[PDB]
Design a protein around this ligand. Sequence first.
Ligand SMILES: OC[C@H]1O[C@H](O[C@H]2[C@H](O)[C@@H](O)[C@H](O)O[C@@H]2CO)[C@H](O)[C@@H](O)[C@@H]1O
Ligand SMILES: OC[C@H]1O[C@H](O[C@H]2[C@H](O)[C@@H](O)[C@H](O)O[C@@H]2CO)[C@H](O)[C@@H](O)[C@@H]1O
Lengths: 649, 649
Amino acid sequence: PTVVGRIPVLDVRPVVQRGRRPAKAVTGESFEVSATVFREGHDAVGANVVLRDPRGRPGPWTPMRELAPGTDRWGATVTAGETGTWSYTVEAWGDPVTTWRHHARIKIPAGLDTDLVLEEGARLYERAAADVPGREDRRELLAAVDALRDESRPAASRLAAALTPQVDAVLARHPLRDLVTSSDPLPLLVERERALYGAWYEFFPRSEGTPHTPHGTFRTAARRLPAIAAMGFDVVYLPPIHPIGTTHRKGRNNTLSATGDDVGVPWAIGSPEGGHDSIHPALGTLDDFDHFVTEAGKLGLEIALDFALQCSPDHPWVHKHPEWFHHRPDGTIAHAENPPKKYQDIYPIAFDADPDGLATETVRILRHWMDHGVRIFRVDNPHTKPVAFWERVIADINGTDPDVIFLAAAFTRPAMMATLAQIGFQQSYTYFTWRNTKQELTEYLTELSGEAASYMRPNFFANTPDILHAYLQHGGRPAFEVRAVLAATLSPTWGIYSGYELCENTPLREGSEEYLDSEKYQLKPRDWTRAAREGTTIAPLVTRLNTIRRENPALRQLRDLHFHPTDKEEVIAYSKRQGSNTVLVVVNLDPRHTQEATVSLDMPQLGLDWHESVPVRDELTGETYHWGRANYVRLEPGRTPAHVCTVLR
Amino acid sequence: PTVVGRIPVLDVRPVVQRGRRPAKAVTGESFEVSATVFREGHDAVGANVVLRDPRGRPGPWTPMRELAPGTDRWGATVTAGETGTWSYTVEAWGDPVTTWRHHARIKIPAGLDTDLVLEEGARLYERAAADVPGREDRRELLAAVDALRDESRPAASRLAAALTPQVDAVLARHPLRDLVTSSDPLPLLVERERALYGAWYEFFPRSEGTPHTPHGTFRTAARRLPAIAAMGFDVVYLPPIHPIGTTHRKGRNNTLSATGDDVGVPWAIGSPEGGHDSIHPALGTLDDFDHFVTEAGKLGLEIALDFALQCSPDHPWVHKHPEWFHHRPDGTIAHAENPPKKYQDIYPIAFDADPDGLATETVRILRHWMDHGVRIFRVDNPHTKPVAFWERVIADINGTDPDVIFLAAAFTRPAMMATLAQIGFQQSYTYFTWRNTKQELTEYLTELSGEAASYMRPNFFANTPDILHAYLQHGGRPAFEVRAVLAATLSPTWGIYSGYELCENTPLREGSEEYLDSEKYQLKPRDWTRAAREGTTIAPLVTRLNTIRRENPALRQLRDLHFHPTDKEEVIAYSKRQGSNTVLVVVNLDPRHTQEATVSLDMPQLGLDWHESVPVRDELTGETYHWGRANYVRLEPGRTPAHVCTVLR
Ligand SMILES: OC[C@H]1O[C@H](O[C@H]2[C@H](O)[C@@H](O)[C@H](O)O[C@@H]2CO)[C@H](O)[C@@H](O)[C@@H]1O
Ligand SMILES: OC[C@H]1O[C@H](O[C@H]2[C@H](O)[C@@H](O)[C@H](O)O[C@@H]2CO)[C@H](O)[C@@H](O)[C@@H]1O
């Protein structure tokens, strides 16, 4: 056997790990399958994509086209349906009819060998007809054959009877393909909509308590759900809900020693009261959790729990499974670190004494929470546990429960971030919070919406309990508004951490990304009712951004994204499309000064000619404009963070 | 099983066609194996390359290093030995000693847990020692263990006794490797020196005749060999040596009708006198060919024959194997084309009626010429015959005779050119003749000496019977000198077509790359003795260029190549290295005007500090200079095309 086939079809993409791991999509998502396709000699080729479903049924006729002249790189868009493991193949072939037409259009006018040319056409169309399944279609082609062979008609009309739009459409549907050659199949994992598309809200239930009982419970915190749903969120992310250790408990503002009342850090998991399968006694019981989950469900909210594989020194594992930790010669276990950050309140897990026991216990714990209606997990610092351990764990869980979604909370070097996604993580945290200038956002999103999108789905949190960027610190509310618009329009999954709405932006000190009086170390009650009454929350904007996402299929996908040039460094423009839905966004990244600029739209990228003028509506205001190749904008911080426009019919 | 191992080792290169085809090298050639290597957490990794020979014997210890900070991309240089199929593996591992050192260097000075730290070191070094095979090495490590454990000494000195250069060198040779993880093996094809390195001369034997017998024979043409060898060539490329058809024979200057005396085009192969396994009767017999081959061999010249799979209409195949041709409805066969070029004197071969017969006959013909001492074939227009046909043919021939070298004469689009090389062609013609400005040369050679070099070996013909570039037309002799220097110094394989020495540069017309009175259509006797006597040949320069190549291992390889900036667009500079051999070249690409410029050498790329000054000798003149970071050059066309300098000890 030869590696290369009769008609070369090479380097099909997407591909992950040379075919050893699947490429990704979700139900209803469109992406490009491509390949390098050409033949020997000078005649034309064609190609097409055969997408097969989990039962092996091929999808519809999907012809490809050359993506740029001289490159022999061909592509077509395909769309994933039901969930499961699919496959895709590229078929390449000689296209004798295109070749013959092109020659015939020169030779019949210039009078060279006309009978021989037309008879050669007739025989092609005869072979075309044999492989057409439909009777009306077959009769149409055999009619063009008899017109091609009628030697009493002028040559130009024998020809034109084979170039009619009626024949075109039969051949575009059932073309004559010579020497059909197939690539080896490549795997596609199709997962549920929520893996790619969703709005996420993070809050600490303990903070939502009462005057008589400041430490909130699942029952008091449930009161916070109707407002979260009213802001248009789909997922609630809860930091760890388990008991919290006492030995080396941290105090307020990340101090080493807790006082008597201090609540500790939820990530310091485990005490005599329980471990990763228990509920912190001050939050309530497993039943109170079921109630919280049930009430979330009625409002269209799914719960995501934090899974953090590590232990306080008081966790039961510390004595039940000493071999899950690395011990130093004196018997002690070194606290976990993430330089320059130190975690004096926890121990890391060691994996090389009993990898089987840890895997077995990890899936037991996830299955526990899954039985209680949690189908989504944020996996904390996955990059400090082995890559292959996550590969195994995710494959075990997704083998019985393929709807479960895992989110990799890894802010680390690129290779590890990409590898985690490739080995099964449905979603990834990103470098979003550190991309704030126009060049940074353009470069980064070009990467995420390009080839990386075949294996990674990004979750754009505009802030987290660990990240209050200097942009928000110095920019105030106008900066909060800009980052919300950006995050909500550039990724189909985005989120915020409670407090973001109120523009909380006081840092621990100058040059830090920690919050002052961080919620991680203390109860943080908030006056939601006052902020709403006084207009000092951006909840309305957030609510509107999520409404726009729900009304615009273009914002529920990632890969179709184009940046349009402007003449000001502080103003950025881009568009996204999905069928007949087109959304155009223009953002002023200066939160302090008003910016005016001309936005020069790449009109072909919108499906329009250069001279055209198109009606848009700014969905943030309800105002309508008429926009074409070149448009003046004026963006004043406080008043207008951005225009978020839809293209009208 | 998981795809990813305990210590991730990913995306090893070079790789060709996802591992389905081998990467390439020749005996004694060095290239870089690389990989993406990292681990979970914060401890250090190391890696190494295990290169295995055809019998499976591993090469020496070959540690890798990170190529740039923060990238997790690791590399090392390996060197291929004997010919055959080798394999290479990357091994990745935790490097506990590097990790412990780095921690210990902070914790001992700052006085934290010092006894515990030093005891942890002692135990690592104890495990190191157990695995060391040498007695003196083992005693050295166990000495450092006892110094580390001596609690009566200050902590800083217990430590310093484990960081000595004597211990360093033991551990760099036999390091402690945790959790060794291996990549899957990748294939390497190692071929003979000549596949990468050689100087090639093309001439038509028929043109080297006498007054009494103008059509040369193998016996008269042999008289031309001593001068070819004296010019330092290693390979003689002969256009087709078979009988030449009469039907539609072309006349002089590519005219359609031959007169009675016209000799025809050698590529129009075949008559009743014979086909691809015969000798043209005017060239002599098979015995005269053996004599020619033998006399070439005595001078250190190998023969490369042209293999052109096509037929004159008088070729015996036309009636013996009609199914090897595509016939039109009236039974005629269309002449071959290569738009806009037409080949009215030949028929192309069709491959889809009897691919097995064509393959079998093709290898029969190549084995015939191989029995007569031809171990190299230039395959004419391979891109008009199926890719898979060549893949099959080359694998059949190389399976019994792996020393046979094939050269792809394909000037076409990039995808086909790369594919031909990947499927087995030892050598490829290139776009060299159309890269003449400094930007064009820099861009192109950066491509060829980069990743493409794992599958393609370039042959830089400065001219061919079909290519007389406008640069040579307008530039005269000074242009011929420049292109010879460039071709000879930028690729380890280069060549010329006879007449190049004499600066033949009259085109067929303005805007054509054909020669006037082309040798393809007529006998072209040349007065070599007169040109030598009158100094009107650049034979001396050519002779000197090949001598320099034979005396400088850096010019007998392709991958080590760096371009150095100059302040003039017409002046280009570059260096090449191989062990302690460094060659530095500066060329003036203006053939009409003298150019002066400053050459600013990237000194680190030469293995030198910025302030240093290095002695060089211009091997074209014997003149010596002293050169450092910034050097004035003055290059006058006619006098000085270039400096070709060696770095002196
Ligand atoms: O109690 C352990 C530490 O918890 C936090 O650190 C978390 C961080 O908030 C989370 O996003 C990251 O992925 O994991 C670390 C460790 O679980 C506190 O900020 C630390 O001060 C605590 O020591
Ligand atoms: O006789 C056939 C044709 O031979 C030449 O064309 C060659 C050309 O020289 C070679 O380098 C190219 O790759 O292949 C063609 C065909 O063999 C003449 O230049 C043509 O005019 C002849 O028709």
